[PDB]
Amino acid sequence: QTITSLDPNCVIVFNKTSSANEKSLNVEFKRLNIHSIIEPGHDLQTSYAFIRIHQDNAKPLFSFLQNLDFIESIIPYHDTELSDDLHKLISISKSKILEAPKQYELYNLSNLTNNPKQSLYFAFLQNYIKWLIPFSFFGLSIRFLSNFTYEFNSTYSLFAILWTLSFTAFWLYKYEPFWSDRLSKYSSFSTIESSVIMLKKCCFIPVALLFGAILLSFQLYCFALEIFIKQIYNGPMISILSFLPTILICTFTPVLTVIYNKYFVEPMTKWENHSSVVNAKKSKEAKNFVIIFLSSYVPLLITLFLYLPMGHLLTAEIIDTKRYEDQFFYFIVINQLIQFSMEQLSSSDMKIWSKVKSYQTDPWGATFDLDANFKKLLLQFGYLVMFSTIWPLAPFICLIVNLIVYQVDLRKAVLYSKPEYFPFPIYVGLWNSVLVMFSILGCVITATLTYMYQSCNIPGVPINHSWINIVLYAVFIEHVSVAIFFLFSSILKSS
Amino acid sequence: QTITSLDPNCVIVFNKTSSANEKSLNVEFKRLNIHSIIEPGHDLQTSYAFIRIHQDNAKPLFSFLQNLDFIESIIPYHDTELSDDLHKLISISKSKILEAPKQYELYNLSNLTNNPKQSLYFAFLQNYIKWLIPFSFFGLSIRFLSNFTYEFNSTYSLFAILWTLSFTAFWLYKYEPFWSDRLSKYSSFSTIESSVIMLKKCCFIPVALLFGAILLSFQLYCFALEIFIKQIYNGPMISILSFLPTILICTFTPVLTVIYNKYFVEPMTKWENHSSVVNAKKSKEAKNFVIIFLSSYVPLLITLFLYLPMGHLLTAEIIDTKRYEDQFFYFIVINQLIQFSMEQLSSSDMKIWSKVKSYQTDPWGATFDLDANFKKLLLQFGYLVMFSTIWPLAPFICLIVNLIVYQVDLRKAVLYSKPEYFPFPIYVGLWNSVLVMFSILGCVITATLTYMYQSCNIPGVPINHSWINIVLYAVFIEHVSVAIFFLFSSILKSS
């Protein structure tokens, strides 16, 4: 018998160190009911177990495997016909690439892959693209038909606020209920398988605040150094010194992140002692999102809320009128492009063996990480909601990047990602609250920015207002946005 | 057979105009299974039906009554043993009146009467008294031990904010879930027995805003008239003209609310066309709370936030240093006292007949109104949360009034109120959101008042700050309070 003729439904990868003992021999007798073949693993301390299971002899095998406690991992490998079906789904997906993804495609993927975790992220991306199409069209129209005042235009900002609140409410209370119903409704088997915890988690707030203060102070100092070298420093090599601010932040941020995770995030997450590992990973992601937030948006907020307004004060011991334009260009086009760029057995038996090996070793063969894929989308959303009023072409670039990212991620998560959910039944959370916070913050910042710079004294865009009126308007916009979001949430929840 | 020997468990009161037709005989024929006695009602167009039911022949009778559509009301009248037990419970309640009511008494009351609404209201009052006892002791201590600066003391204000947030969170997420579990857990029979509705309700927001603007403008005009009369008016009858402001406000508020209800609240509520009459009553109460809020809290807010600070500005075309003191005294002692003050058959057969008469006619015999009894408590809570920093004796007066009100309301709702829930099983909402709003607003107002008047230039208590810092502090306190409330809610909900 050969692996190809077997058409395995699952691989029981165990450490070959334990398979040196006859436990691997014993599990063969335990598998007297279903065919199995054992082959050496990727390394000398692993050995694959290509087995085929049905809906009948599924629960006993996993009930044994739970107590076996000598298995490295378990993968619900796709068989030949399922692999062909998913290849055909991908082939249908690649055609009409420029067109928005269609809902019925996601239903086929959810019925075939049976992965609610993938379905949730892909539904979020589909909703994002569908809502971004009208925003992209509106941005193009306001940029071209109303090119006279394409920067900080009142109508575009009203549309941005309304679109942000409506999209957040619609996703939270009209689509996410349906799609997350599949998280527990199907929940066939994730192959991975109280108040004191919340009290302990609250104790990390001062630590996050302190580290955010450290990061903010360093970034402010780096901005001061950059403005120094670019305005009032008269050295010969201007260009060479211009790289110092970028390398300084690009070397301090990873160091701060690594010390943060090594000494604060990991020990405190261990101290919390979460029941399930998924909760521990979610808590670590939530704690680590503060650094990402303060490293992604802080430079633009410093350039906009400070620098441009208060530059005239710091003349004693001419501001760049277009600094924010190129900064936003770099953070909305170049940065997203970079992120996309960096992120004796027979031939068929060897193909299956290499597929399992890629599932176990290669970075693209790792299991679908919903958190790391939601984080990039939410960061792009924050960029599109907080600063699209600067450049109305941000929705269009975001839409194009989203289409490319969707077409790449579908292929990766379907063909190469290690499966997690079996077809046969056997025995979002943080990114919603972060999305809501991003929506409110984006509405506030957009309204405040357009109040500030609609009649700004800087040519081609100081403020004809005071530091009191701006803050009062920001508070008013925050309150009105919260009220509008509450009304939308109630209206959509009643359905 | 006599009514006393019958010991009725329920009265089927039907209109005697319909009982002129032989339907009174038809229901008697249906009542061939359980004993029944029919007597003339309170008026010539009503007739009582003293009947006794058990858990067996109860559902068919009530299904007949539902199909009958000629009944006036149905009352689960207490029998002799239940009446004696409730009399004993009241007799136990009256003793230890000055002591806080005990939980086992409420457990006995809920087991005997089986009324979830009464249990909920009395649980709220019990929790309120229990939480107000330490606040009362703290107020006494700060008034007497720290009498030097008893007005607007920082420690008392911090305690007020913390106590408010903790009380709201504890009631919402530790006691209310348990007590409201009995709302549907028992739910034996209330004898009374979607997106378009929410959209239609939202259309009333501009109407409420317009009416609130009208009321606020009128109250501001009357405040200006009062300050003119008492400060810049040199007429002979200074005392007689002092009554005119109060007379004007007390005649304009009732006509304003009567036109509000007759022209706006009723037509719009009918337009929404709520399925249940309970929802209609709740919606009518919610819209009418804006007028009550603006009639109760605005004058003190006008006296504190305005008048005292800006009195010097309006000197041209000496402010009362104790105006707010006497106003708070009147609104926290006298007003609550006024509210409490203003709010051939045998002898036993006559007693039962008169009891049914009182159930059907007398105002104290009306069914227990949870909304009208929650509203008074919430208004007192709003006063105590917004303005107790002025006079630290407010918690003590509130506790005394609450104990008296509880001892009166237990007797009323137990002995005299018409019952709604049967023992045999047969086939809060607005005041929580209002409570949370009162908590946040009270924290904000207390903090702002303490900031303003701790170092006020008015003797015996202009502001050493500006109109910017005060608003900034108010916004900061609102955000901090909402964050603290969210943390408390999460901590208590995880349990």
From Swiss-Prot, chains A, B:
The chain crosses the membrane at residues 120-140, 152-172, 204-224, 240-260, 289-309, 381-401, 428-446, 468-488. Its main location: membrane. Residues 141-151, 225-239 are extracellular. GO terms for cellular component: cell periphery; cellular bud membrane; cortical endoplasmic reticulum; plasma membrane. It is found in: Cell membrane. Residues 1-119, 173-203, 261-288, 402-427 are cytoplasmic. It is a multi-pass membrane protein. GO terms for molecular function: chloride channel activity; lipid binding. GO terms for biological process: chloride transmembrane transport; endoplasmic reticulum membrane organization; protein localization to plasma membrane; regulation of phosphatidylinositol dephosphorylation. Keywords: Cell membrane, Membrane, Phosphoprotein, Transmembrane, Transmembrane helix. May be involved in ion homeostasis together with BTN1 or BTN2. Interacts with BTN2. This is Increased sodium tolerance protein 2. The chain holds residues 3 to 591 of 946 of the full protein.
